[PDB]
């Protein structure tokens, strides 16, 4: 199965075992399996994580502006800021999307995408 | 039509469920809490009067 | 005469209460910084680990790579702390920061300074050299948003060439509680070392190009760490 | 949301009830209070005669 | 203004009654450890919460130390004050209002349930029944009480 | 019936007669003064006890209100205003000029270092040009409010004429910072 | 508190508190500095800074001494002052201003004359 | 070391430095509590709580209260007790084991009565 490491600028933020994981880079869309070939890549600004989690679990994961990088060993995304959608702050996310300032309203995006919307 | 209204009445009445949960104690402790402001004030008001009672005689 | 003896008394009575105390909690605080040292070295290993990767399939021609023809002009971060009873620390920086703007005058540049914290941006305004910028208000406990804004404006200043020629940061290595020291250390242009013996999206040019910034910021949030570990 | 407005409807009759006990029991201990000063007074009056 | 710092008893225990004996063993140790961590009061959140009960404790047996003049309280009503501290009942109440629940309490207890100091002074002794009708009378009246910033003490 | 206490830790540091303005006292005060001398120093011993109150509080502080700071530049204006060179005595209409800039506040913008070359020239100057303001504060012992006019028209006059005296580490230990490549030297 | 009513023994314990706990903080105050203290110590040292300041007062028999002329305060208007200062009311005026001045309706004419 | 042996000069040395030390930690053990301790001087802690009790003696005058006999411990067995406690040959047993001993043959009898 695969080895996965959210790695935050500040924190080992999570770590352990899934079976695929979902995400939006700038060269499009992707999702990897246990045999995926080596690569780096960058997320967009707006992007989402989705873990589909061994023993059947799941996780969805605001990220703000990461980089993804395989190899056989083990997938680790390292992320200036990232938030879980079980702990997603739902409320203010809907007036920070409408803001002037690209990146905040991009990371107000991003966390309505670990919405579900 | 009616099956997306059933979806957004299913969130409007659990939201107003929790929120009515959430405002029920609230309006019970408001009561409450004056309540027993004006029970320490009915108190002290029969001690002080007590006091000037004292101190009168 | 006796009662200002007395007095003395019970003054030093009450600062040797206020000192015994401030030992104490500084040996606390010394275990939350490098208890936050260690939880952020894992994202700089890695960061390391996918910038010697890319760079091997890269051109290695970021501008952050390659020296100016006539530099005139280099930029430097001097740290330092937002309040006192520190002892050295204040001098111990500020004396290499002197150190090295005589050896830059002695290659032939001329430093442009920014500063960290309230005690260097009160030497450099008795001293009579201006501060191009200056953060104050976080040395306690930096957080990575500030680390951010210290090294767009350092890149930005570099990417100019109102310019610079060269970055360094000015700092303390915390080596261990007994034991640390300022280090002055060049920043950018970065020198590149060739040792012995992959899909990129969109491509490894671009990528290069958009994370040496990002590198850049993880790289000054490091010695901002080591900077509040070696305060305490 | 018929089982919260009715949790609304009896909290706020429950409220009715506890603020009545409550204001009723500090009737008994003004009682109790201004009785021992009463006492207190007569006593200084005693003493000073 | 009684240092109890430094002032000192030769006789000690023997001069004490068992109910007495029973609450103050404590007292002068938790003076002793709130006087040495005075200084931290300034940083009371960086403390460890271990330490951070001490302090708070202690604030609230020097205030409970505290008596206006020509109010002496007998044995059964000052068993009763220093239990309050000791056994940690007083650490929900800010400090700014501690005299004024030991005296409301006391008061209180006065007139609705004398059966505790009866108790106290014929025996000597605090029995775990008097000890069980004091905690339920405390209780009782911390829901009757009110903070001078008007919080709830419960 | 008063003190002046000449203290040695004053003395030394330039502050020349070395009168301890805390301590120091005379308790007949401004009764045994000229008017002009009244109206002028009235206040001036409680301001600089307040100053010096002051100074020994502030001594390590980082930053200060604006009442403060200004309470602060003109004690240190008015202690250099008062020190005094051994056989030089002023005549009471040149104290009384030389006292009015100090609580008027006319040394305020002059900065502390020249304060006594401020006083000396222009004591001098009213001297030389102005003459008639001293021989009103010393035939009648007021300043009238005329003089005080004229004395403020040539201190600002004079103002405008002023001059003040405004004024290796080892490129081996220095280190590098590097990006690392996984391929043998080109 | 018998003799004097409440107020005025409230008032004037609180006061003696305040100055009492700035006496004790001096000594530190001159060494390590007033920013060093806690938010609660430097506002206690900036109340009785003022307090010992509100003290003093221009008496009648300190013509001589100060020049201005001398002023009574009322005992209900000593209490109303102290007990605003002591609660920090006046935290927002500058030091120098109640310094020798007598009652409130004149420490508000000095504050304005600042 | 000319009076008392050589090796009792030793172990009283040792003895001392140990509990000196802890008397310097006993601080950050009251303030910050033993997991803020590093695991080299957490392991002299160990030592130092066994030996402070150790010191600890049922004497005569307490057979008035305890019953048991009061105990008399030659030189030559302290001198060892000590040599063989601060190299930390005792530390797997509780601080209950070295409470009221006395020799330390009875100290193997209490052990393996806990």
Request: net charge negative; aromatic share 6%; glycine share 6%.
């Amino acid at each position: 199965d695969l080895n996965v490491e959210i790695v935050a600028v500040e924190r080992e933020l999570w770590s352990g075992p899934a079976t695929f994981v979902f995400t939006r880079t700038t060269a499009g869309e992707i999702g990897i399996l246990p045999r995926h070939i080596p690569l780096v890549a960058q997320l967009v600004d707006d992007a989402m994580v989705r873990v589909e989690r061994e023993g059947e679990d799941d996780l969805r994961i605001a990220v703000d502006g990461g980089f993804l990088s395989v190899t056989e060993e083990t997938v680790r995304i390292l992320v200036e800021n990232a938030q879980f959608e079980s702990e997603i702050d739902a409320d203010a996310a809907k007036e920070d999307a409408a803001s002037d300032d690209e990146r905040t309203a991009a990371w107000g995006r991003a966390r309505l995408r670990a919405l579900g919307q | 039509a009616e099956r997306e209204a059933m979806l957004a009445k299913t969130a409007a009445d659990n939201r107003k469920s929790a929120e009515q949960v959430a405002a029920a104690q609230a309006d019970y402790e408001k009561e409450m809490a004056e309540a027993r402001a004006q029970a320490s004030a009915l108190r002290d008001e029969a001690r002080a009067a007590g006091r000037s009672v004292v101190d009168e005689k | 005469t006796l009662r200002e003896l007395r007095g003395r008394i019970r003054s030093a009575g009450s600062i040797k209460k206020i000192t015994k105390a401030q030992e104490l909690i500084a040996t606390s605080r010394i275990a939350k910084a490098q208890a936050r040292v260690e939880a952020a070295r894992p994202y700089a290993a890695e960061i390391t680990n996918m910038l010697t990767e890319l760079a091997g399939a890269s051109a290695l021609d970021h501008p952050l790579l390659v020296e100016r023809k006539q530099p005139k002009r280099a930029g430097v971060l001097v740290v330092s702390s937002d309040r006192g009873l520190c002892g050295a620390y204040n001098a111990n920086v500020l004396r290499r920061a002197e150190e090295l703007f005589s050896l830059l005058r002695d290659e032939g540049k001329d430093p442009v300074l920014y500063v960290v914290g309230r005690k260097a941006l009160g030497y450099f305004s008795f001293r009579q050299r201006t501060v191009v910028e200056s953060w104050t208000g976080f040395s306690e406990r930096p957080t990575y948003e500030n680390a951010r804004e210290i090294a767009d404006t350092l890149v930005n200043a570099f990417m100019a060439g109102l310019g610079v020629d060269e970055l360094h940061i000015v700092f303390t290595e915390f080596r261990s509680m007994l034991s640390q020291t300022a280090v002055a250390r060049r920043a950018a242009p970065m020198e590149v070392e060739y040792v012995g013996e992959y899909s990129f999206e969109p491509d490894p040019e671009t990528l290069f190009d958009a994370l040496l910034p990002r590198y850049i910021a993880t790289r000054v949030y490091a010695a901002l760490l080591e900077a509040a570990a070696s305060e305490s | 949301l018929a089982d919260a407005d009715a949790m609304h409807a009896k909290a706020l009759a429950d409220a009715k009830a506890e603020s009545e006990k409550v204001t009723e029991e500090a009737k008994q201990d003004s009682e109790r209070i201004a009785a021992q000063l009463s006492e207190q007074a007569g006593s200084e009056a005693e003493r000073i005669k | 203004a009684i240092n109890v710092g430094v002032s000192v008893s030769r006789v000690g225990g023997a001069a004490q009654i068992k109910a007495m004996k029973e609450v103050a063993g404590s007292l002068r140790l938790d003076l002793s450890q709130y006087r040495e961590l005075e200084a931290f009061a300034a940083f009371a959140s960086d403390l460890d919460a271990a330490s951070k009960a001490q302090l708070d404790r202690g604030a609230r047996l020097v205030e409970l130390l505290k008596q206006p003049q020509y109010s002496p309280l007998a044995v059964e009503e000052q068993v009763v004050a220093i239990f309050l501290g000791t056994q940690g009942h007083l650490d929900s109440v800010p400090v700014e209002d501690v005299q004024r629940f030991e005296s409301e309490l006391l008061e209180h207890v006065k007139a609705s349930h004398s059966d505790i100091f009866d108790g106290i002074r014929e025996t000597k002794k605090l029995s775990e029944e008097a000890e069980e009708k004091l905690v339920s009378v405390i209780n009782e009246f911390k829901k009757g009480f009110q903070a001078s910033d008007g919080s709830s003490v419960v | 019936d008063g003190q002046c206490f000449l203290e040695s830790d004053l003395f030394n540091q330039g502050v020349r007669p070395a009168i301890n303005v805390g301590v120091s006292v005379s308790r007949v005060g401004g009764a045994a003064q000229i008017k002009a001398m009244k109206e002028v120093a009235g206040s001036l011993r409680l301001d600089l006890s307040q100053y010096r109150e002051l100074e020994a509080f502030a001594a390590f502080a980082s930053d200060l209100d604006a009442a403060s700071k200004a309470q602060l530049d003109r004690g240190a204006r008015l202690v250099e205003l008062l020190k005094q060179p051994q056989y030089s005595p002023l005549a009471v209409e040149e104290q009384v000029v030389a006292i009015f800039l100090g609580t008027q506040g006319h040394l305020d913008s002059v900065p502390v270092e020249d304060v006594q070359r401020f006083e000396s020239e222009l004591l001098e100057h009213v001297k030389a040009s102005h003459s008639d303001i001293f021989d009103g504060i010393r035939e009648t012992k007021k300043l009238s409010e005329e003089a005080e006019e004229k004395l403020v028209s040539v201190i600002n006059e004079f103002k405008k004429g002023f001059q003040a005296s405004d004024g290796a580490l080892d490129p081996e230990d220095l280190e590098k910072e590097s990006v690392k490549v996984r391929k043998p030297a080109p | 508190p018998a003799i004097v009513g409440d107020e005025h023994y409230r008032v004037a314990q609180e006061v003696i508190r305040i100055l009492q706990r700035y006496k004790d903080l001096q000594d530190i105050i001159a060494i390590l500095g007033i920013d060093e203290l806690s938010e609660e110590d430097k506002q206690l040292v900036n109340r009785a800074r003022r307090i010992e300041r509100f003290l003093s007062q221009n008496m009648m028999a300190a013509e001589q001494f100060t020049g201005q002329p001398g002023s009574t305060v009322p005992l209900k208007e000593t209490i109303e002052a102290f007990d605003k200062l002591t609660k920090g009311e006046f935290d927002h005026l500058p030091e120098q201003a109640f310094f020798l001045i007598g009652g409130l309706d004149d420490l508000a004419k000095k504050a304005e004359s600042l």
